[PDB]
Structures are given as C-alpha cells and as structure tokens.
Amino acid sequence: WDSLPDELLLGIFSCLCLPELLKVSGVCKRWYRLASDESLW
Amino acid sequence: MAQSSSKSPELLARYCDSLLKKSSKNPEEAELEDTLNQVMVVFKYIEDKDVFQKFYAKMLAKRLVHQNSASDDAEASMISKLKQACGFEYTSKLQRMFQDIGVSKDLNEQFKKHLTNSEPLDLDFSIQVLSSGSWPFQQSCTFALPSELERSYQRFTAFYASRHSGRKLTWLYQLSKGELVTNCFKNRYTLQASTFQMAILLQYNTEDAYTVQQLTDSTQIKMDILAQVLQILLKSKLLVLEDENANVDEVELKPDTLIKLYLGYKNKKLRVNINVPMKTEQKQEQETTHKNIEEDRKLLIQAAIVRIMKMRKVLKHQQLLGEVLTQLSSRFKPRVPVIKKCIDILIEKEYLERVDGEKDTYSYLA
Amino acid sequence: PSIKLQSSDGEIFEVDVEIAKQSVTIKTMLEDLGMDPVPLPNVNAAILKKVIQWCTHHKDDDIPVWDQEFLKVDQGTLFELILAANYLDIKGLLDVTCKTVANMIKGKTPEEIRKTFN
Amino acid sequence: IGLDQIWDDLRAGIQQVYTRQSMAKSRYMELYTHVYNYCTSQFVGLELYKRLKEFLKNYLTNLLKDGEDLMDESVLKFYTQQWEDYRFSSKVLNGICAYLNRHWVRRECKGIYEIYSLALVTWRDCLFRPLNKQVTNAVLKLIEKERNGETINTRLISGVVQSYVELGLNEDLTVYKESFESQFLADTERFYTRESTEFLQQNPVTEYMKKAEARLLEEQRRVQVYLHESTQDELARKCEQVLIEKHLEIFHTEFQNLLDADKNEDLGRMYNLVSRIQDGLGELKKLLETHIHNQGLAAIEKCGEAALNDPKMYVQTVLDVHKKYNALVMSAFNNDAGFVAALDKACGRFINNNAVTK
Amino acid sequence: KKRFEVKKWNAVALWAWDIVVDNCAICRNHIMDLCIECQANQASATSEECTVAWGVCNHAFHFHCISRWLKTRQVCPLDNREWEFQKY
Ligand SMILES: [Zn+2]
Ligand SMILES: [Zn+2]
C-alpha cells in the first residue's frame, strides 16, 4: 500500500496467472487500474 | 654451327658420359651423385627431351660394352633420376643394358667355375652377350678371325648350343678388343687394340708386308671402311708406307701401295692402347644416330594421333593443328614446316583419311 | 575484502565484498568507484540484519522452499524487506520475496485479500 | 515530499559532483536516496529526468563559451580535459540517479530514455558544431608534427578519439569515423604525396623505399599508440598506394637497374614493397624473366664459337646462371610462384636456341 | 722371326632366336623390299620405307611388318604375357 510503489507492487502482480488478475482486479480502486496493462498481458 | 637448335640436349648428354665413364682416377661418391642431380635440374628444361633420349643410350650402350664407366653403382643411380617424370621409356631400356651386362658377368663365372671341370683353353676370353634389341650396335660385313680365336669361338658357339636349342648369334666385331705382344721389336710392347686391328697387326707373322687387297681378302672385312683402321695403325708407327714423306692422315689410300711393318718401332711407354676411331666415325657416330632422330619425330606420331583420338572420331581439322602436342609432344618441338609432311604418310598404310563430311576432317582406322 | 555497512539506525557489519556485490546499488560505488563507510539512511540494521545475512547466503547464484523459511515473518517485517532490496536494488531477494507478496493472493478473494492487507 | 526543499538539495549535489570537491560517501547515498525517495510515492521519474537534462544542457551550453575559439593545442587540452573530467562525473551521476534508470525509463516503449547515455547524448551539443571540426584540425596539426614532432599530445589526440568513439552513436564507430577518420585519412593521403615525390627527386629510389617502408610501419605504430584501431587497414591501404605504387613506375624502372647490378637487399625490399599492391608485380615478373633470359644468354655466348666443342663448360655455364637466379628467387622474391615461373620460363627460353645450336 | 700373339682378347655378341632374321616369318624369299603389299603392287609412296626393324619378344622381321601385320586384341601371339616397344 502507501509505502509500496507502483513499479514494485506491479511486480508482484506479474507472477499471477492472467485469470487471477481478475481477483486482484477488485481488491481496491488502486489495485484495479494497476491490473490493467501496465506491463501485464 | 651445323643447323642445330637442339644440339644442347646432346651436350647435356655428352656431359654425363664424361661424369661416369671410367675417370682417370675415380669420382668422389657424393661429388658425382650430387653432380648428377644438377644435370637433371638442367634436363627437366630441355625443349626436345627426345634427343637426350637416344644419344644417352649410345653413350651407355658403349660405356657398358667396354666397361668404361667406373663407379657402376653411381650410374646405377643416374637411372633413378631419369625414371621420375619424363615418360618411362628410359626405365625399360637403359638399365637392361646395365643388368644384361650383369648376367654376362655371371656368364663368365659360367665359364670359369665350370671351366675348371675338364675344359682346356689357352686364352683370357670373356665375352659379353648383349641385348640385340637394345645395344644399337650395327653389323655389316662379316669378319673371320684367325689364330687363337677359332679355338674359343666354336668352343663357345658350341657351348651356347647347350642352352637354347634354336638360339642364333652374332658376334660384334665393330666392337671387341684384345691386347697383343711384341717379341720382335727393340722392346716389349702390349699392343692393346681392336679385333679389326688385331687382324692386320697379325699379318706380320706370316710373309713380311702385304698390300691393301692382299691384306684385305686376308680378313675379308670391308674395303672401304678398311683403310679407316689401316690408316690408324699407320699413324701408330708400326705399319709404315714405302715413302717416308707422307701425311698418312690425309693421304687418301689405294690398292696398289704397300703397308709393311716398321721393324723396330720405338715408343714412349709400354702397353700402348690404340683404339681411337679412325676419325671419320667420330663424325659418322653423330649423323647415323643424329638424323636418326627424325625416325622418331614422325614414326611415333603415326600412332600417336590415335592415342588422343581415343575419344575422337569426328573432328574438324581446325582443331587438331596442335592437338597432337599438348598431350604428346612432351618430347619435342615440331617446327612449322616439319609438321605437314609425315601426315601424307599413314594414308598408304591404312590409317587416317580425309573424311568426306568436311574439307577439314580426319577418318580414323584402328 | 572487507566493506562496512553503517545501517540507518547505527549498527555496522564488517561485510565481505561479493556479499555486497549482489546489491547493485552498492556494487557500483565500491569497486572502480569505491567507497568507505557505506551509509544506508533508508535501511536500518534491524532490517539490514536479515538482509546482509540473506545476502550472505545468496552468493552461490518453482517458488523456492528455502526462502519460505527465511521469508516467513509477519507482513510488516516483509513489506519492509521489499523496500530495502529495491533500495540496494538486489534483484534476487526482491524477486523471491516479491513472489511471496503474491502467494498471499494465490487462492483468495477481494474482501479476502483485504482481510490480510486491510 | 518537498522539491522546493528537495530538488535544490540535489541540484547542489549534482553540481558538487560535477566539480569533484570530492564528496564524502555521506552524500552519494544522501543524494541517491533523494532520487529513490522521489521515484517512490507509475511515472514519478519524468520531472526529475526533465530537470537533470537541463542541468547538463545548461552546464555544457555555458562552458562551450570557455572553449569556443580555442586553439589547436590549447583546444585539445580543453576538450580532452573537459572530457575526462566529464564522462567521469557523468557516470557517477548515473548511480546517484540509477534508481531512475531502471524503472521509470524502462517505460518508454521516444526521446526520454536512459541517463549516462543522455550525458553523452547531451555532450553532443558540444561536438557536432562547436569544437568538432576545430578539435580535429587541432589533432591534425599535431599528428602532422609527423615531421620532427613532440611526444605527449598523444594524450591530446587519443583523448579526442576516445570521445569521438564513445559518442559513437548512441542516439536511438560512425562519428569518430565521420568526424575524424575521414579527414585524418584525407590529410594523411596528401602528407605522404608531397613527401614521397619531392623525395624521389633528390634521393634514390632504393633509399626511398627505406623511407617508404619506414612510414608504413610508422603510421601502423601510431594507430596502435593513440588512434582507434578500426583505422588501421585503410590507412595501410591509403599510405601503401601512395608510397609504393604511384611510384610503381620508378620502381618498375629502377628494378631493371638492380637486376643489372646485383643490389639484392634493395631489389628485395622492392619485391616486398610492391607485393603490397594489387597485382603490381606483373611487371617485375615479366621484367625479371627478360633479364636472366638475356643473362643465361650472353653467358653461353661468352663461351661458344669454338667453345661449344666442350660438353661440360656449356652445361656448366647454364647451370651457374640458373643457380644465381634461383638463389635470388627464394631470397629476394620470397620464392613467390610468380618469379620461380619467370625463372623457369626464361631458362626454357635459352637452354634451347643458342650459339651451340643455331 | 716376327710374331705378336693375342695376349688377351675379349668379346661381345648381340643375340636372337635361332634363325629367322632373314624374314618377317611372313615374307620368306630374301631381305629386300617385299613386305607382300609393296611387292604385289609396284609404283607407290610407301616402297621408300621398308627397312629392317626388331622387336623384343624375339621374332625378327622387316620395318613394314608391324602396321600391316599385328593389330587384333591384346599381346603378341604365342608369347603374350607382356610387351615392350623400344628398339628404334
Ligand atoms: Zn616383310
Ligand atoms: Zn612396305
């Protein structure tokens, strides 16, 4: 969260199988856009 | 001088004769050997490697007969070099004359060890049966040799009958030698000479001096060529003419002039050799085997037109002009005029013909 | 080799060369562009502790099982470990660890995530 | 954060660092951090990057003035010097800024991209038009004291080459080659044309070649000592043409002289100097061949009229000549097939048509 | 009186097979220019070249008794095995 940046946090979301990103997709506002391609897909 | 543009290979030839022939003393082994290689570096450049070919044998054919080529092992080598890369013709002939001259050396032992058997004979005989189909030595008139030969001649002839039920023989007379003795002159001499010389030099045991013919029929060799030998003996001072003044060299010679014995005959030193040709055959030697060269330029190529024609039977005359050289003339450089001449020859021998297809065609018969 | 590491808080760790070389942030400033007391105002010892040693272990270099043991501390302690490897920029540790920050999502739901991430 | 309290804090360090007042490691991190802290709050990189860029732009653009109009000795000191001093702080700027390189830039899939690269890239607002020509002529002058010259500008020249290369471009061995090797080579091509010929006017061919053979090695050496290596083959190509073939005619001529004398040593470095030029031997080969053909010639004549009447002397006369020249083929012409050939041809062009025969 | 005796003599002799040298073993009549073909039809440009020539397998014959008498398939009859030209 707060402390954790985008570039980093966006690294975690990189070891998740695409379909999984649908779960994270709704955790919280921020997490949503992040799920949208920035490096993923 | 004379019109020779190929006299060179004759030199490269005359050279080797000098190098091996029995030297005044002997060669240093390596010297000779190392030296022979040189002649070869030279030879593999010779344009018409076909002339060095023949004379080279006429040199050896003689060096062997007489055995005047010391260090035989050496020459046994100058073979090896000639073998490599200039045809293989030299490998056939040459050495034979050098190995044939060997069996004969064993033949001698055929006469000696056996001789002891029960074989009387007062002589130091020792003949060298040559390979007729090799040693270019020609035979012409028949010479018959008296005193102390007809004791061996038939002895052998007879002996040889022993080993070849249909064998024939022919003794070389233009070429064997023998030493003599002078129990009659102011001193003792070992007159070494030729058969033809031994002859007239022996006609002084019977009635003192005779004349050409009276001295010619005696041996019945051959009159013209006779005076050749005679004149030599004359220059030796054994047989002098009737008149002191005379240029025995040049004089010519007639059937009505006397040739006797020089009762006495001083001399520098004993065992006098005398076997240096009259002078003429020193010339004849060349021409006989010189123009002889032509006998192969052409002869060879009447069979050497097919050798390439193996893969040819329908060609145009525009092509062949030179298609007998690239893969053949690796023996001589046929001049421009001497190429169109022997071609006229094979038509009459059942060979090529002007194919009736084009004005420029050859028709091979084989 | 023997380099220092006066962590943000105060402690120091007589560390070996290649031990720091894994931390690209430092591997630069030490070799050709060396340093001497290597400060780290962002990563305290309490943190560097696990670090330097984590680093200690890794020098001999599918979710690893080994690190599962070392990387098995409360969240906070971990969500600090992201931030100190990113800092000294040590890919490795960041990578693994990071993955763990994912294994808390492997098999959960939205309100379920939040139930551990708040 | 606070940039109006944060950036300046860093502009100072980026400044300090570009002056090497030698800052204590108490700062590297302090600085690095600032960055790290900035790019952590997925952009957070741009501004900082936009800002740094200017910092370099200005500093160079306002230090060109210290360089422009500079001499060709004085200028090199200036560029070379400012270069080292730069690529250095340039690099150390990287780490203090490294954090920015690896993420923030990573997202570019335009202009904005890396940093150390930038520094270089930006310096290219201090080369293309500024000192460039200027700096290279400087180098050219020096290298021209290819005459009795002085020794250390090496640093002055190699120093340029350095930046001309790594300036190599980068954007998105050319510069150094466009900007430098082009002219350098050019100028070099003239230097030896003025020298070669003028020389061949008041000196021996075979005194020239020693001067020829000398400079080729010489310029070979300079490429190694301080110019970039890529610039070797060619320079060899150029200087070769110039010092051995263009003169390939005096050589062709002189050659026949040596052959007449027996100046092997000379004759030899010719077969070595020519050899360096495309099929430029053709003549020596045909030339030589004519020689020993005439040699074995006069040779055998000097003996036969009534001397062919000597079997050995003849075959001897021949072989001797053969030896001398085979001797010279290996030694002088390195047993090059081309000459052995000339040797053979010519021998087979005399052994058979002479005064012993005709 | 006078006298010279053959202290020592030497000799040599080219060989051959019995006696056949007088003919090509084909043209038996004499040793002139016959060779059959050149004696059956006079007036030509080949009667100028019909001297004497030898071989290697010992048979004895003329000079023209080589081309108009031989060619077939392999080596000399009776004495095959191998053959050599030489003897010019
Ligand atoms: Zn017949
Ligand atoms: Zn006939």
Side-chain angles (χ1 to χ4, degrees), chain A residues 1 3-41, chain B, chain C residues 1-61 63-118, chain D, chain E:
Chain A
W1 44 105
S3 66
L4 208 71
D6 268 40
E7 7 87 25
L8 283 176
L9 175 157
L10 174 58
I12 312 164
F13 296 1
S14 301
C15 305
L16 313 175
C17 298
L18 303 64
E20 281 192 285
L21 293 181
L22 280 180
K23 293 200 303 168
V24 289
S25 174
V27 181
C28 69
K29 302 178 185 60
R30 186 181 62 197
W31 281 48
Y32 182 171
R33 56 183 171 72
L34 290 174
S36 312
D37 190 359
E38 244 154 50
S39 78
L40 326 171
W41 312 108
Chain B
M1 293 213 297
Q3 153 307 85
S4 198
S5 184
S6 57
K7 176 65 178 301
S8 164
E10 179 166 340
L11 278 307
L12 211 255
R14 274 272 288 304
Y15 190 15
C16 264
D17 176 47
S18 170
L19 292 196
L20 300 320
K21 291 188 61 191
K22 224 74 163 298
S23 177
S24 290
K25 271 296 175 268
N26 91 86
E28 308 190 9
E29 183 195 67
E31 168 71 48
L32 186 69
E33 171 69 11
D34 198 44
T35 296
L36 285 307
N37 270 320
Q38 278 202 308
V39 174
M40 273 307 252
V41 119
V42 172
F43 153 67
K44 313 164 197 176
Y45 273 153
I46 268 76
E47 190 166 289
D48 300 349
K49 304 186 176 188
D50 75 300
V51 161
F52 179 80
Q53 171 181 58
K54 284 176 184 179
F55 268 74
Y56 187 75
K58 290 206 159 55
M59 293 296 100
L60 168 147
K62 280 188 168 298
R63 272 191 300 288
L64 304 182
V65 171
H66 320 201
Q67 123 231 195
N68 193 299
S69 298
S71 299
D72 294 50
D73 211 296
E75 213 172 72
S77 173
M78 223 300 264
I79 349 290
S80 311
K81 299 72 181 70
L82 299 184
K83 294 179 65 179
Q84 301 175 43
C86 164
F88 196 63
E89 314 293 298
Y90 302 135
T91 309
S92 152
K93 309 184 170 170
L94 295 167
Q95 181 190 177
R96 191 189 187 187
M97 280 185 246
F98 190 64
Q99 66 178 301
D100 186 65
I101 190 57
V103 66
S104 41
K105 297 176 66 182
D106 177 44
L107 180 62
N108 294 302
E109 299 180 304
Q110 297 177 45
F111 197 54
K112 303 300 305 74
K113 262 181 176 177
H114 167 48
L115 179 59
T116 310
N117 212 269
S118 163
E119 276 172 287
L121 178 54
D122 57 284
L123 198 59
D124 296 53
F125 186 90
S126 203
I127 170 166
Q128 295 295 63
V129 184
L130 312 186
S131 303
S132 184
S134 310
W135 315 64
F137 303 116
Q138 301 177 319
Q139 219 303 77
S140 240
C141 312
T142 297
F143 188 91
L145 179 74
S147 88
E148 307 177 359
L149 235 48
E150 193 69 68
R151 173 69 283 183
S152 310
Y153 173 36
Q154 222 264 294
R155 161 64 159 281
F156 229 59
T157 299
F159 193 66
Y160 205 66
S162 56
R163 308 182 173 184
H164 295 283
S165 69
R167 57 14 170 178
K168 156 143 217 288
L169 333 170
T170 116
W171 294 51
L172 310 175
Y173 296 84
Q174 323 174 173
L175 267 86
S176 177
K177 307 68 63 178
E179 314 186 313
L180 292 177
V181 205
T182 68
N183 295 308
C184 52
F185 290 163
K186 186 164 297 183
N187 291 268
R188 194 98 70 217
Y189 293 86
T190 331
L191 274 280
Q192 294 195 56
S194 74
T195 312
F196 290 176
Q197 291 187 66
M198 291 287 251
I200 56 290
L201 267 172
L202 280 172
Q203 292 295 293
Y204 284 88
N205 303 175
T206 305
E207 329 136 344
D208 304 334
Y210 255 23
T211 163
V212 183
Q213 301 184 186
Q214 192 177 68
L215 198 43
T216 301
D217 300 300
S218 313
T219 58
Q220 206 174 190
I221 308 176
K222 198 174 180 289
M223 160 286 280
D224 119 76
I225 196 173
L226 227 70
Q228 280 193 58
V229 184
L230 201 286
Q231 172 183 171
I232 295 194
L233 286 310
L234 307 177
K235 189 158 171 302
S236 92
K237 284 58 176 160
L238 269 56
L239 289 56
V240 196
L241 299 177
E242 322 83 299
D243 182 307
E244 305 294 59
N245 275 301
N247 195 39
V248 270
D249 299 339
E250 300 179 0
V251 175
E252 300 179 0
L253 300 180
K254 299 189 180 180
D256 299 339
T257 188
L258 301 56
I259 287 67
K260 57 273 248 58
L261 167 267
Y262 189 61
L263 181 57
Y265 171 53
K266 326 305 100 58
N267 177 72
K268 56 198 70 175
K269 54 218 297 285
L270 292 80
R271 188 100 84 61
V272 159
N273 176 318
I274 33 177
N275 300 321
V276 170
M278 335 155 260
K279 272 264 67 219
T280 178
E281 190 161 5
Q282 194 79 212
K283 165 66 178 180
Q284 311 164 185
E285 209 77 311
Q286 270 184 157
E287 59 177 308
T288 58
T289 179
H290 180 288
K291 180 66 184 304
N292 163 298
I293 198 61
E294 278 297 54
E295 293 205 52
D296 286 292
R297 323 270 180 168
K298 306 64 199 61
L299 281 172
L300 216 67
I301 299 176
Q302 316 310 294
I305 303 178
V306 188
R307 294 169 170 290
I308 302 72
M309 182 169 72
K310 268 56 178 296
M311 308 300 272
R312 290 187 173 66
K313 56 289 177 178
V314 178
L315 54 67
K316 301 175 180 177
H317 174 302
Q318 184 62 173
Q319 301 299 303
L320 183 62
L321 291 184
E323 289 196 2
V324 184
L325 311 171
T326 313
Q327 192 187 188
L328 168 60
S329 61
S330 60
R331 284 290 191 173
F332 54 63
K333 182 187 182 301
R335 294 164 296 182
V336 302
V338 300
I339 359 183
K340 179 64 187 61
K341 202 291 104 176
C342 58
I343 204 70
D344 297 52
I345 281 44
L346 332 154
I347 315 176
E348 117 277 60
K349 314 175 291 180
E350 313 307 305
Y351 281 64
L352 272 172
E353 185 182 304
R354 209 184 202 70
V355 176
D356 297 66
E358 284 191 297
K359 50 184 176 177
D360 293 318
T361 54
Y362 293 68
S363 155
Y364 90 103
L365 271 169
Chain C
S2 37
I3 181 62
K4 295 202 169 186
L5 283 304
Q6 182 192 299
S7 300
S8 78
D9 37 15
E11 290 198 64
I12 306 161
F13 294 73
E14 172 77 279
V15 179
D16 186 2
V17 284
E18 272 52 351
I19 305 291
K21 287 201 64 183
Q22 67 180 64
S23 163
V24 314
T25 270
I26 311 180
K27 199 221 72 56
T28 50
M29 318 198 159
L30 223 172
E31 308 292 300
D32 295 301
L33 180 62
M35 292 170 106
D36 287 67
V38 206
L40 322 176
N42 268 34
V43 167
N44 66 59
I47 305 174
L48 206 182
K49 193 67 170 298
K50 303 286 291 180
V51 195
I52 183 51
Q53 59 191 187
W54 181 101
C55 307
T56 307
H57 196 92
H58 275 73
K59 61 149 292 182
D60 315 60
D61 295 291
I63 297 67
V65 180
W66 182 76
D67 282 296
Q68 285 188 49
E69 185 175 359
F70 191 73
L71 295 187
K72 203 165 189 177
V73 297
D74 60 73
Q75 297 181 58
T77 300
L78 182 59
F79 276 91
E80 319 169 297
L81 296 155
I82 293 298
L83 294 169
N86 172 51
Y87 190 79
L88 308 172
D89 190 296
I90 315 182
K91 180 167 176 292
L93 178 156
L94 187 57
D95 268 45
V96 51
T97 46
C98 176
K99 308 169 59 56
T100 62
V101 191
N103 274 172
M104 316 192 98
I105 311 298
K106 295 303 295 292
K108 303 189 179 185
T109 43
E111 209 286 298
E112 186 59 67
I113 304 302
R114 298 171 278 185
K115 278 184 55 54
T116 63
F117 282 15
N118 318 64
Chain D
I1 299 171
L3 303 144
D4 197 58
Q5 180 44 67
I6 298 302
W7 179 63
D8 68 310
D9 300 44
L10 187 252
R11 208 243 249 84
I14 297 185
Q15 186 183 308
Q16 293 161 42
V17 71
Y18 256 81
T19 329
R20 323 142 76 156
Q21 211 285 314
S22 308
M23 89 236 85
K25 284 92 65 297
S26 313
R27 259 274 167 181
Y28 287 58
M29 304 300 137
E30 201 171 63
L31 287 178
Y32 170 88
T33 302
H34 280 287
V35 185
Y36 178 100
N37 294 179
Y38 178 58
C39 315
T40 287
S41 310
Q42 183 227 274
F43 276 69
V44 288
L46 174 123
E47 301 310 351
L48 174 36
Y49 178 108
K50 289 191 175 185
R51 271 177 167 51
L52 302 191
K53 166 177 294 178
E54 292 179 357
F55 174 95
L56 292 75
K57 169 67 87 56
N58 216 50
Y59 166 105
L60 303 187
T61 61
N62 297 190
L63 107 115
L64 196 216
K65 308 175 178 177
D66 291 324
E68 269 164 344
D69 299 339
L70 300 180
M71 299 189 290
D72 299 339
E73 300 179 0
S74 63
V75 78
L76 299 190
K77 290 171 178 283
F78 177 78
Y79 177 62
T80 59
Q81 186 117 174
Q82 302 298 336
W83 189 221
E84 257 71 351
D85 272 64
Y86 188 63
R87 154 161 164 295
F88 186 85
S89 276
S90 293
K91 192 135 71 68
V92 74
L93 165 78
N94 231 48
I96 301 193
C97 216
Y99 186 51
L100 184 114
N101 284 161
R102 47 222 45 184
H103 288 327
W104 150 218
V105 176
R106 213 181 302 178
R107 301 305 284 295
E108 90 281 356
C109 326
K110 299 67 186 301
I112 295 164
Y113 179 17
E114 164 76 303
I115 259 167
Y116 175 74
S117 60
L118 200 187
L120 290 198
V121 153
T122 290
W123 181 265
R124 234 182 29 192
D125 90 323
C126 171
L127 182 256
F128 259 123
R129 169 88 289 171
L131 330 160
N132 198 310
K133 214 139 55 52
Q134 208 174 166
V135 154
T136 300
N137 315 89
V139 168
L140 262 308
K141 293 277 216 67
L142 250 167
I143 295 183
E144 211 214 312
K145 301 184 175 168
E146 184 177 306
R147 248 270 80 179
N148 305 299
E150 296 183 5
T151 290
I152 300 222
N153 304 319
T154 289
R155 299 190 180 180
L156 302 178
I157 301 171
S158 89
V160 178
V161 187
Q162 203 78 36
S163 173
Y164 280 8
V165 185
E166 160 170 2
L167 244 9
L169 300 180
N170 316 302
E171 294 177 0
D172 300 338
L173 279 194
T174 74
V175 186
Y176 159 89
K177 214 181 192 312
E178 55 177 45
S179 308
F180 177 88
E181 184 178 357
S182 159
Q183 304 84 111
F184 162 78
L185 249 161
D187 192 340
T188 281
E189 206 200 8
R190 150 170 175 54
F191 183 105
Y192 293 92
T193 347
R194 164 182 276 311
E195 182 201 274
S196 48
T197 162
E198 119 64 61
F199 192 89
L200 262 146
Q201 175 177 58
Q202 295 180 299
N203 309 273
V205 38
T206 162
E207 238 280 300
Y208 158 67
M209 317 198 247
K210 303 202 204 321
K211 182 171 189 51
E213 155 171 340
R215 291 285 189 180
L216 286 153
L217 299 184
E218 197 176 320
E219 293 281 56
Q220 181 171 308
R221 201 204 325 299
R222 278 315 185 76
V223 184
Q224 292 156 176
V225 177
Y226 66 71
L227 295 174
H228 178 300
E229 102 242 56
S230 44
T231 317
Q232 246 253 42
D233 289 80
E234 200 150 359
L235 211 175
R237 250 191 294 103
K238 271 300 185 48
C239 274
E240 270 170 79
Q241 175 198 82
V242 138
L243 319 167
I244 299 107
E245 71 189 359
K246 299 189 180 180
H247 300 289
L248 218 260
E249 208 200 301
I250 351 179
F251 293 156
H252 288 308
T253 304
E254 164 73 315
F255 190 81
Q256 171 55 32
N257 282 316
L258 320 179
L259 259 267
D260 287 305
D262 283 322
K263 285 195 177 68
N264 289 178
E265 202 275 317
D266 294 309
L267 190 42
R269 71 161 67 42
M270 175 159 276
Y271 170 79
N272 284 205
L273 262 181
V274 179
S275 73
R276 295 247 253 304
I277 300 313
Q278 66 168 294
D279 297 317
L281 287 82
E283 200 56 19
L284 311 181
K285 164 269 176 280
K286 285 198 286 180
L287 212 23
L288 165 50
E289 170 177 1
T290 289
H291 193 100
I292 68 184
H293 166 25
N294 293 304
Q295 277 295 64
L297 232 304
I300 85 121
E301 187 172 10
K302 299 184 293 181
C303 5
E305 287 180 2
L308 74 73
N309 191 63
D310 172 307
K312 187 188 65 174
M313 193 186 298
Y314 172 99
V315 163
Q316 265 290 165
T317 302
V318 185
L319 217 150
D320 270 328
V321 184
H322 170 56
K323 295 302 182 182
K324 164 166 189 177
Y325 293 107
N326 181 180
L328 186 69
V329 155
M330 309 179 184
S331 58
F333 320 127
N334 185 186
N335 197 70
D336 176 304
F339 298 71
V340 194
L343 205 180
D344 294 301
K345 297 316 301 174
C347 291
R349 185 167 174 54
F350 85 69
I351 302 180
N352 324 287
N353 299 319
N354 307 315
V356 174
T357 303
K358 183 187 298 185
Chain E
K1 57 189 291 78
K2 305 182 184 65
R3 172 84 162 170
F4 300 58
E5 277 184 60
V6 176
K7 178 182 185 54
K8 179 180 180 181
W9 188 62
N10 287 287
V12 287
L14 297 173
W15 46 214
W17 245 56
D18 55 293
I19 184 283
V20 184
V21 184
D22 297 60
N23 300 298
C24 287
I26 305 300
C27 49
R28 207 296 180 180
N29 56 63
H30 201 182
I31 44 67
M32 300 181 272
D33 301 300
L34 294 302
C35 60
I36 303 300
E37 182 179 0
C38 294
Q39 57 81 292
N41 299 300
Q42 195 63 60
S44 60
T46 179
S47 60
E48 298 68 58
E49 183 180 0
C50 294
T51 60
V52 182
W54 294 62
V56 297
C57 53
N58 300 300
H59 286 130
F61 41 58
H62 290 131
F63 187 109
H64 199 176
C65 292
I66 300 298
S67 179
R68 70 174 188 62
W69 175 60
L70 193 60
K71 290 62 183 179
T72 299
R73 73 182 189 67
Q74 290 295 60
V75 191
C76 181
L78 184 59
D79 125 71
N80 301 60
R81 186 178 300 297
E82 75 296 66
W83 67 300
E84 300 180 60
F85 194 62
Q86 65 181 181
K87 184 62 180 60
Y88 310 72

